[PDB]
Enzyme design. Structure first.
Site, PDB file in Angstrom:
ATOM      1  N   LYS C 159      41.893  34.706  36.585  1.00  0.00           N
ATOM      2  CA  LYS C 159      41.357  35.651  35.610  1.00  0.00           C
ATOM      3  C   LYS C 159      42.185  36.929  35.573  1.00  0.00           C
ATOM      4  CE  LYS C 159      36.715  34.158  36.912  1.00  0.00           C
ATOM      5  NZ  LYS C 159      35.535  34.579  37.713  1.00  0.00           N
ATOM      6  N   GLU C 185      37.037  44.739  43.760  1.00  0.00           N
ATOM      7  CA  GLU C 185      38.447  44.390  43.792  1.00  0.00           C
ATOM      8  C   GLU C 185      39.027  44.687  45.168  1.00  0.00           C
ATOM      9  OE1 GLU C 185      37.515  46.717  41.353  1.00  0.00           O
ATOM     10  OE2 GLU C 185      37.297  45.364  39.634  1.00  0.00           O
ATOM     11  N   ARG C 186      40.191  44.105  45.429  1.00  0.00           N
ATOM     12  CA  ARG C 186      40.907  44.334  46.671  1.00  0.00           C
ATOM     13  C   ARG C 186      41.948  45.432  46.484  1.00  0.00           C
ATOM     14  NH1 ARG C 186      40.304  38.433  46.274  1.00  0.00           N
ATOM     15  NH2 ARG C 186      42.246  38.278  45.073  1.00  0.00           N
TER      16      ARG C 186
HETATM   17  N1  LIG Z   1      50.648  30.780  34.413  1.00  0.00           N
HETATM   18  C1  LIG Z   1      50.704  30.792  35.748  1.00  0.00           C
HETATM   19  N2  LIG Z   1      51.916  30.846  36.341  1.00  0.00           N
HETATM   20  C2  LIG Z   1      51.979  30.860  37.675  1.00  0.00           C
HETATM   21  N3  LIG Z   1      50.981  30.826  38.560  1.00  0.00           N
HETATM   22  C3  LIG Z   1      49.795  30.773  37.947  1.00  0.00           C
HETATM   23  C4  LIG Z   1      49.569  30.756  36.580  1.00  0.00           C
HETATM   24  N4  LIG Z   1      48.210  30.695  36.308  1.00  0.00           N
HETATM   25  C5  LIG Z   1      47.657  30.682  37.496  1.00  0.00           C
HETATM   26  N5  LIG Z   1      48.553  30.727  38.531  1.00  0.00           N
HETATM   27  C6  LIG Z   1      48.250  30.726  39.957  1.00  0.00           C
HETATM   28  O1  LIG Z   1      46.843  30.656  40.114  1.00  0.00           O
HETATM   29  C7  LIG Z   1      46.406  31.616  41.102  1.00  0.00           C
HETATM   30  C8  LIG Z   1      45.632  32.715  40.424  1.00  0.00           C
HETATM   31  O2  LIG Z   1      45.589  33.859  41.302  1.00  0.00           O
HETATM   32  P1  LIG Z   1      44.768  35.153  40.925  1.00  0.00           P
HETATM   33  O3  LIG Z   1      44.739  36.123  42.036  1.00  0.00           O
HETATM   34  O4  LIG Z   1      45.307  35.699  39.606  1.00  0.00           O
HETATM   35  O5  LIG Z   1      43.322  34.585  40.622  1.00  0.00           O
HETATM   36  P2  LIG Z   1      41.999  35.112  39.915  1.00  0.00           P
HETATM   37  O6  LIG Z   1      41.181  33.886  39.520  1.00  0.00           O
HETATM   38  O7  LIG Z   1      42.303  36.065  38.829  1.00  0.00           O
HETATM   39  O8  LIG Z   1      41.249  35.807  41.115  1.00  0.00           O
HETATM   40  P3  LIG Z   1      39.789  35.922  41.726  1.00  0.00           P
HETATM   41  O9  LIG Z   1      39.715  35.205  43.030  1.00  0.00           O
HETATM   42  O10 LIG Z   1      39.535  37.428  41.829  1.00  0.00           O
HETATM   43  O11 LIG Z   1      38.876  35.331  40.648  1.00  0.00           O
HETATM   44  C9  LIG Z   1      47.676  32.067  41.812  1.00  0.00           C
HETATM   45  O12 LIG Z   1      47.987  31.186  42.885  1.00  0.00           O
HETATM   46  C10 LIG Z   1      48.714  31.984  40.695  1.00  0.00           C
HETATM   47  O13 LIG Z   1      50.033  31.808  41.199  1.00  0.00           O
HETATM   48 MG   LIG Z   2      41.657  37.467  40.150  1.00  0.00          MG
END
Ligand SMILES: Nc1ncnc2c1ncn2[C@@H]1O[C@H](COP(=O)(O)OP(=O)(O)OP(=O)(O)O)[C@@H](O)[C@H]1O
Ligand SMILES: [Mg+2]
Ligand SMILES: Nc1ncnc2c1ncn2[C@@H]1O[C@H](COP(=O)(O)OP(=O)(O)OP(=O)(O)O)[C@@H](O)[C@H]1O
Ligand SMILES: [Mg+2]
Lengths: 48, 50, 464, 199, 93, 146, 464
Positions: C159, C185-186
């Site tokens: 996200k 958030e962290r």
């Molecule tokens: N388009 C992309 N290109 C490269 N890596 C991606 C892509 N989309 C997702 N990822 C990977 O998916 C993961 C998403 O990490 P991120 O910290 O952004 O998660 P989040 O879902 O936003 O966090 P949270 O745990 O707060 O919900 C990472 O390992 C990232 O490398």
């Molecule tokens: Mg995230």
């Protein structure tokens, strides 16, 4: 007070400078008040 | 229909100064007898004539 | 007017007052800690009356080290924060004290964080369509200016990546004053965002304030209101369109549950607050675009334990217009923009506002995807041998299109080390019409992974 | 002449504004009204709005004018009542709902009827709306509401995505009043069509 | 017709301005006349006299009855026993 | 113009018609409150589901009656309530005004327009809770609704 | 002597009495309510003693407009209802007031509602073959005179139509008296039933009583008891066969659950009130035919969400011997009777008192249906082409039987223009034997649907 209520009524008077005049009496749950501030508030709250 | 909407907007932009034109004299004449209204209010609020 | 503390437990504290004077609801109180190592003042907030001139209150700071009999003073006012034109370009805490330069401020205007939502006659429907370089977004659920945007999903499904990609797009293509906030958030993400904004040379016009994980719940409940207050101050006085970003609203609701458990109120279903609808409604309605003021928002919401039946997103569903969703299975498939097309929905999409070709293409794509989902159950066990060719053709078409929905955004620059791309909407719709026509079926499947446009599609296909 | 009253409970003011705009474009505002209880308000208005709408309808009902009533939602009222009861230290019930809630709905839906010719030719109809989650009927609120209604229509998203815009499931939908309401020509032309579609 | 509706809406805005001005003048002049004119010392006595007359002319009203049941009965019995037993009470007794 | 003159004349007629009068009624005190609810002490002439007033202009409804307390719920704004207020019973069951002028307008559940302009000419007010018609007063249904 | 009221909430009211004034359980109490627009006479019945002459009870009317301090008076008796021969052709409420004429029925003798179960020493099972004209009931589950037969099913299955057709068919050929009681049902259904009975001359021969849903649950506890009181008064004295018909029994169980919840009693696991089976047994025993008197009871039971794990239907079955239930899947198929033959059963079907012809009729049809249910999903997914010759012929036979079981009813005239039909028993036996031995496998699929009789089948075959 003796006319409206057959029982004798005591008097305990409290000085109220906030009111612009009039008098307020409380014999318990019931109450009677004639106050300039209260009447003017009632008048202004119903203007519209 | 767009033309009719535009002419309606023109009528609105005429009325939006018409009300101000009327309200100028409205506010000019509002205080004609404001003192009389206050006197009547005082007479009623006190229960006797002022 | 001197108060005395009688009973304390957890973050919730009771106070007693002289019979003559008792503070009105929503008023700040000041205290102190006499300990040397843990010397600190505390700000307390009135919660409710319990009779006998007693008041319940919540601490804004950790409550350790307090002893009974400590004097408590009242300021006879609600919590206020500084407002002014020079606020932007600085980082703030929950209480409003500047962080980078301590003591900064204290001379701007000061406004309370409790108000009333705008009246009924000042609202107005909005329909301005807003475009973006992404294709899956403007194909299915185009975004509308002045509305609300929702990004539903589970845990760790990128996200934050989408959020920062969108803020990058909006900052680069458009200016305007912007306000960012956030809860749950962290600190590492905070440092990364600060560094990126400093690099972008646009952090000067962005207001920043946020809490973190390790804080008392009162801050986690008040920071959102403070940020909304400063945003409203920018919207009203300046008469300027405002960009707003908030993150992980769900934690907010969670905080309330905790404090409810300490107040002693009767629990509700699944151990939530006895009342939760009213606070969500008042927080949502506080964001509203006036005729002369257009405000665009985008909130990220969390989903606990990968379940959609919980009341936390269930109530939020009723306050949204443009919504996109994420799934674990689609992410496990491999494509990173794991956006469910069958579940995403929008309200701006209508033939009266959008071209007929767009509507028809979208309907056909939805029908094909739904048919493939329907047959997914049967194909799971037998396969393709029993299935007739009349459905094999649509199976191949559906696989190709669902692989084509992938994209390579710029946001992955630090993960795969490849530049991203952007596509105009006309190219997207014409390419999707061509693909639905079936002209591309002869091309191999693995050529549609992480591609930007049809020209790159052809180049990659011919390269193998 | 038919006079209709629309009631909205706990919706964003923008949605009511959009509905009012579409209806104004329709131009029916010479014979309709709206009762608004936005979600930002307190529990009292949400708990009380349907009763106000019902009374407004009943006043014209007694006069002999035909009235139509539509409720935007009904689960919001139950939620508000549950919150009030839990606040007032009343004992809870089955997943934290007060027991008597069913009775309330009866007192809201028994008013609609048709008067006898002695008191006039007035009529009144209602179209309550219920929201469900994951097309689940096991939750007892839909079960309670179903048992005190003369007929219902089921809608599913799968049929919506298939292509059927009304997306009504004829397998389950049924009406107890039957064809006595519809015109005789309709009855002669069409009969047992629901059966034929079912087979 | 909608334009005429907004015309009546601006008439209502004029009515709102009228209400605001009337309220302002009313509150100001009433407050000044009651804090300046009727603030005379004899006015208090006059108001008291009028209030007494009003309380005199009003129709009479009925008033009665000026904590557990067993406790009340026990208290009444104890009071009766005290009254029947304190006949010989002395000044120092 | 003369319309504003007539509005001012009506305002003065209201001024020349105001006459507040003392009356006999009972009072009460708010022991405690919070979360939109409150408790009242005394006031022994209350009625089940009867309306009551508050000093700030908001209105309350009595839901349950304990032998020495009355629990009530606040309808509108509730952040202007503190212990020590004065309450007054209205001696009337909750009611709503009704009239034909309500057509084409949007009102709050109490019956005060929020978005419309002007006011409503309500001929009568009727109680919210009533009794449904009996079986002897009903008739079969035959007309269609297209 | 009289007492006062101390606590008011919902329907439950508790009152106080002086010394030597407490009444026993279940006594009528009168409370007076005065108002400008709402004047009534609250009638209450004693529920429980709380000690110190504080007794808690419920009310028969809504408690709107009540005020504390109002005196309560005692009549020193339980609930009573007038009975007699003049009660026929009239409508009454739970309290026994005549709805048609407000002043009627105020001179007949009165009997107490509460009674005592009959002695066990005067119990004898009743065996008799009473026959109707409908095929399913004639063949599957024959009825028995003097016994209990109940209906089952979820919402909107069409059991009301079935009971109406049953009463229409039986009351004409009956010389006894019938009493109808409605515990819970819509006003429209009752008014339509009253109009229909007025359309014929049989209305004079029966008695009616019912209560609606809008009333408080207290009124839904005694209507069944009043009906049973009238029935026993007729049966014990007149010595004539009587008919007692009950619309439903789930509603009063619901109202008991809610009133017990309000009473402050600890609920059970499912949420039902404790000792519900005690009330079940107390109510069910009252319907009993002695050695000299015969009474027939008709009832239909609503199940919640069509779930048979609910203990309430399970405990209500134990009082039943011959039962017929309904299902929703067969209704969704298109069949209106919607009677499931696999689960329906009786207690008088046996070669002992009935010819074994019926026995192997039932065995053939039941085994056919069971194996058809076994092979259903196979023919649905795998395909009819893979089945064996015997299985294919049997599946065709089962389809013939399933299509032939449906039959029109005259009560469907207002819904379908085709008039109903009636067929005797021996011809149905012969026709089923012909079908199950496998001679009518050449008829088309539609030729077996909605068939009056065998000659009707031949006519429709000649119509195609
Ligand atoms: N388009 C992309 N290109 C490269 N890596 C991606 C892509 N989309 C997702 N990822 C990977 O998916 C993961 C998403 O990490 P991120 O910290 O952004 O998660 P989040 O879902 O936003 O966090 P949270 O745990 O707060 O919900 C990472 O390992 C990232 O490398
Ligand atoms: Mg995230
Ligand atoms: N033989 C029939 N032909 C046509 N329609 C029928 C037939 N039998 C029943 N129906 C239909 O079934 C419905 C009858 O509803 P009914 O009151 O009998 O149901 P119920 O099972 O008692 O349910 P509930 O108590 O929920 O109302 C109507 O829609 C009616 O048209
Ligand atoms: Mg039925």
């Amino acid at each position: 007070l003796s006319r409206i209520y057959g029982r004798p009524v005591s008097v305990q008077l409290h000085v109220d400078p906030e009111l612009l005049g009039g008098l307020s009496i409380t014999v318990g749950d019931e109450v009677i008040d004639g106050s300039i501030a209260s009447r003017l508030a009632a008048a202004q709250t119903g203007l519209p | 229909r767009a033309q009719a909407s535009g002419e309606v907007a023109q009528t609105l932009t005429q009325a939006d100064q018409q009300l101000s034109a009327q309200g100028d004299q409205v506010r000019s004449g509002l205080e004609s007898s404001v003192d009389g209204l206050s006197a009547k209010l005082a007479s009623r609020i006190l229960g006797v004539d002022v | 007017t001197a108060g005395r503390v009688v009973r304390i437990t957890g973050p919730v504290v009771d106070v007693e007052f002289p019979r003559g004077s008792v503070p009105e609801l929503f008023n700040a109180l000041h205290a102190e800690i006499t300990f040397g190592a843990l010397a600190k003042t505390l700000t307390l907030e009135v919660a409710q009356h319990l009779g006998d001139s007693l008041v319940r209150c919540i601490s804004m700071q950790p409550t350790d080290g307090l002893v009974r009999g400590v004097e408590v003073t009242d300021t006879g006012a609600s919590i206020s924060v500084p407002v002014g034109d020079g606020v932007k370009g600085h980082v703030f805490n929950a209480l409003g004290d500047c962080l980078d330069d301590p003591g900064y401020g204290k001379d701007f205007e000061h406004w309370s964080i409790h108000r009333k939502p705008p009246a009924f006659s000042d609202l107005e429907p909005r329909t301005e369509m807003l475009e973006t370089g992404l294709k899956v977004v403007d194909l299915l659920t185009p975004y509308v200016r002045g509305g609300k945007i929702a990004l539903f999903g589970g845990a760790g499904v990128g996200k934050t990546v989408l959020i920062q990609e969108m803020i990058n797009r909006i900052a680069r293509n458009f200016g305007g004053t912007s306000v960012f906030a956030g809860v749950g958030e962290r600190t590492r993400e905070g440092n990364d965002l600060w560094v990126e904004l400093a690099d972008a040379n646009v952090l000067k016009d962005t207001a920043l304030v946020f809490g973190q994980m390790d804080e008392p719940p009162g801050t986690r409940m008040r920071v959102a209101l403070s940020a909304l207050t400063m945003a409203e101050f920018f919207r009203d006085e300046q008469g300027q369109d405002v960009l707003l970003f908030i993150d992980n609203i769900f934690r907010f609701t969670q905080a309330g549950s905790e404090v409810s458990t300490l107040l002693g109120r009767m629990p509700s279903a699944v151990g939530y607050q006895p009342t939760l609808a009213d606070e969500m409604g008042e927080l949502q309605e506080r964001i509203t675009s006036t005729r002369g003021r257009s405000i665009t928002s985008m909130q990220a919401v969390y989903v606990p334990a990968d379940d959609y039946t919980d009341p936390a997103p269930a109530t939020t569903f009723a306050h949204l217009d443009a919504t996109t969703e994420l799934s674990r299975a689609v992410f496990s498939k491999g494509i990173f923009p794991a956006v469910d097309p069958l579940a995403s929905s929008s309200t701006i999409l209508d033939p009266a506002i959008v071209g007929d070709e767009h509507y028809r293409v979208a309907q056909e794509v939805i029908r094909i995807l739904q048919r493939y989902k329907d047959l997914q159950d049967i194909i799971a066990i037998l396969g393709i041998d029993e299935l007739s060719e009349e459905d094999k053709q649509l199976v191949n078409r559906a696989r190709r299109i669902e692989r084509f929905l992938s994209q390579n955004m710029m946001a992955a620059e630090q993960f795969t080390g490849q530049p991203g791309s952007t596509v105009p909407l006309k190219e997207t719709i014409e390419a999707f019409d061509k693909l639905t026509k079936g002209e591309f079926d002869h091309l191999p499947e693995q050529a549609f992974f992480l591609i930007g446009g049809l020209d790159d599609l052809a180049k990659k296909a011919e390269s193998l | 002449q038919v006079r209709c009253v629309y009631v909205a409970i706990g919706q964003k003011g923008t949605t009511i504004a959009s509905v009012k705009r579409a209806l104004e474009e329709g131009g029916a505002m010479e014979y309709t009204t709206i009762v608004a209880a936005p979600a930002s308000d307190a529990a009292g208005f949400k708990w009380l709005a349907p009763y106000t709408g019902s009374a407004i309808g009943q006043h014209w009902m007694y006069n002999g004018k035909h009235v139509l009533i539509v409720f935007d939602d009904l689960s919001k009222q139950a939620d508000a009542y549950r919150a009030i009861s839990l606040l007032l230290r009343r004992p809870p019930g089955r997943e934290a709902f007060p027991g008597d809630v069913f009775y309330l709905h009866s007192r809201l839906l028994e008013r609609c009827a048709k008067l006898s010719d002695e008191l006039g030719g007035g009529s009144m109809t209602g179209l309550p709306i219920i929201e469900t989650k994951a097309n689940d009927i096991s939750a007892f609120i839909p079960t309670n509401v179903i048992s005190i209604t003369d007929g219902q229509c089921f809608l599913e998203s799968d049929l919506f995505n298939q292509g059927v815009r009304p997306a009504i499931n004829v397998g389950v939908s049924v009406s107890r009043v039957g064809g006595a309401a519809q015109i005789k020509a309709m009855k002669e032309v069409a009969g047992s069509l629901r059966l034929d579609l079912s087979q | 017709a909608q334009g005429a509706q907004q015309i009546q809406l601006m008439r209502q805005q004029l009515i709102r301005q009228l209400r605001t001005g009337l309220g302002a003048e009313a509150v100001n002049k009433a407050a000044e006349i009651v804090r300046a004119h009727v603030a005379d010392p004899q006015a208090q006595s006059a108001t008291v006299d009028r209030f007494l007359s009003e309380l005199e002319q009003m129709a009479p009203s009925s008033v009665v009855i000026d904590l557990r049941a067993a406790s009340r009965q026990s208290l009444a019995a104890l009071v009766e026993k005290f009254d029947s037993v304190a006949g010989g009470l002395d000044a120092d007794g | 113009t003369i319309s504003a003159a007539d509005i001012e004349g009506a305002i003065e007629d209201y001024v020349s018609s105001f006459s507040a009068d003392t009356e006999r009624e009972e009072i009460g005190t708010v022991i405690d409150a919070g979360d939109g609810i409150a408790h009242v002490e005394g006031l022994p002439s209350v009625m089940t589901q009867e309306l009551l007033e508050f000093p700030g202009g908001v209105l309350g409804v009595a839901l349950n009656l304990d032998e020495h307390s009355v629990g009530a719920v606040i309808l509108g704004e509730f952040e202007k309530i503190e212990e020590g207020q004065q309450v007054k019973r209205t001696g009337e069951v909750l009611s709503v005004p009704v009239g034909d002028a309500f057509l084409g307008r949007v009102v709050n559940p109490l019956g005060q327009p929020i978005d419309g302009q002007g006011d409503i000419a309500a001929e009568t007010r009727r109680a919210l809770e009533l009794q449904a018609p009996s079986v002897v007063q009903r008739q079969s249904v035959s007309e269609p609704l297209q």
